[PDB]
Write a structure and sequence with these properties.
CATH architecture of the largest domain: Sandwich
Strand content: over 45%
Oligomer: monomer
CATH topology of the largest domain: Jelly Rolls
Helix content: under 10%
CATH class of the largest domain: Mainly Beta
Number of strands: 33
């Protein structure tokens, strides 16, 4: 990829380093916060100390009329709750009004990601990606987004999102671009004291990446063996999740009654949360919460991986129960129950966790229930029993809605968890 900068967490020295081979120095401010689950994820808040400065290896400093180059990174931007029309920088490689930079903005309910080039005569070119907050379920709001920006000095700058080309702008009218010796990762000019971003995997490439390269990069950095929650973070054990069923996003999961004679079902309406002319979204913190419990994961840590065997705890009136069924019950759709954990006995309760990767909304999960001999009982979804859509496990080779997302409470979403 002609990679000339690759910011990566290194376990041995417990530190962010440049692993490109060029050994650019990475200085971290005391205001930077790290995810304890994934040390590549760093949080930059609106504080002077919340910054990362890269001192570029002399050989990778950009000063050229013709050198093609690209950059990639992942970013997670909290919902905007207030207007600003206050464009603020987040990644800066500028000196004397020339170079490149990434900035963010929020206007007319659109969150914007902005790429700017500026030549040594002060002339600017920009390419923008934007997405609306006026939408029931967003692939983008407060979710990890993969950004790739490529620059061909003889033609266009292009912005790719999650491996897909979104926008292009001609940049052939720019002359010499003399960028900074340093790259500054920092909220610069942001007037909201409480704004922040999450970022990871920042890369620079000494070429214009092509379509295939970018899709491969996206796929390789997706960590596709690990399940994701709604926000795109690693799915985890022992963490309460609200459940989104993608079949009918306007409904939510509820428990009619606990016990092996009870059932769960699809209840509506989910409803919406609104701040007029700022956002209008489906309410996410609705319905029964699931907690994923370790059973047979080979691993030590709390991350849920493809084909992990787990138990699912179901929270009802602030008490935990176990998702289970008697597969011997009549019919191909096995109605699921929330049963008292000490009393689950010989009921089927082992769930195989699966990723679902297609070209629709990201971070989809499936759950395949098995009996205690490993035999498939079926994927967890719904079946219409006259008037009621009940939660069931059903073998597809023997009913609907077996695609799920797990939603934990997150400060960037802004529904109150009170």
């Amino acid at each position: 990829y002609n990679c000339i900068l690759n910011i990566k967490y290194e376990m041995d020295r417990d530190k962010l380093v440049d692993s490109s081979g060029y050994r650019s120095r990475i200085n971290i401010g005391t205001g930077v916060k790290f995810s304890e689950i994934d040390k590549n994820q760093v949080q930059l808040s609106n504080l002077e100390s919340s910054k990362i400065e890269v001192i570029l290896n002399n050989g990778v400093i950009y000063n050229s009329m013709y050198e093609n180059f690209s950059t990639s990174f992942w970013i997670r931007i909290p919902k905007y709750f207030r207007n600003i029309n206050n464009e603020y920088k987040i990644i800066s490689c500028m000196q004397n009004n020339s170079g490149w930079e990434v900035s963010l903005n929020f206007s007319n309910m659109n969150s914007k990601i902005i790429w700017t080039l500026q030549d040594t005569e002060g002339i600017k070119k920009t390419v923008v990606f934007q997405y609306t907050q006026n939408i029931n379920i967003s692939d983008y709001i407060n979710r990890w987004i993969f950004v790739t920006i490529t620059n061909n000095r003889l033609s266009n700058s292009k912005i790719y999102i999650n491996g897909r080309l979104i926008n292009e702008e001609s940049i052939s009218d720019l002359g010499n671009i003399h960028a900074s010796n340093n790259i500054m990762f920092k909220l610069d000019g942001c007037r909201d004291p409480h704004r922040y971003i999450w970022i990871k995997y920042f890369n620079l490439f000494d070429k214009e990446l092509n379509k295939k390269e970018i899709k491969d990069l996206y796929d390789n950095q997706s960590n596709s063996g690990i399940l994701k929650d709604f926000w795109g973070d690693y799915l985890q054990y022992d963490k309460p999740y609200y459940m989104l069923n993608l079949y009918d996003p306007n409904k939510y999961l509820d428990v009619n009654n606990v016990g092996i004679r009870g059932y769960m079902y699809l209840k509506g309406p989910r409803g919406r949360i609104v701040t007029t002319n700022i956002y209008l979204n489906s309410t996410l913190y609705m319905g029964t919460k699931f907690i994923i419990k370790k059973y047979a994961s080979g691993n030590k840590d709390n991350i849920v991986r493809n084909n992990d065997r787990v138990y699912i705890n179901v929270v009802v009136k602030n008490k935990e129960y176990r998702l289970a069924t008697n597969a011997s019950q009549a019919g191909v759709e096995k109605i699921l129950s929330a049963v008292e954990i000490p009393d689950v006995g010989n009921l089927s309760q082992v769930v195989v966790m699966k990723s679902e990767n297609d070209q629709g909304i990201r971070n989809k999960c499936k759950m395949n229930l098995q009996d205690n001999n490993g035999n498939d009982i079926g994927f967890i979804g719904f079946h219409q029993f006259n008037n009621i859509a009940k939660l069931v496990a059903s073998n597809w080779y023997n009913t609907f809605g077996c695609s799920w997302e797990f939603i934990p409470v997150d400060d960037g979403w802004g529904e109150s968890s009170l």
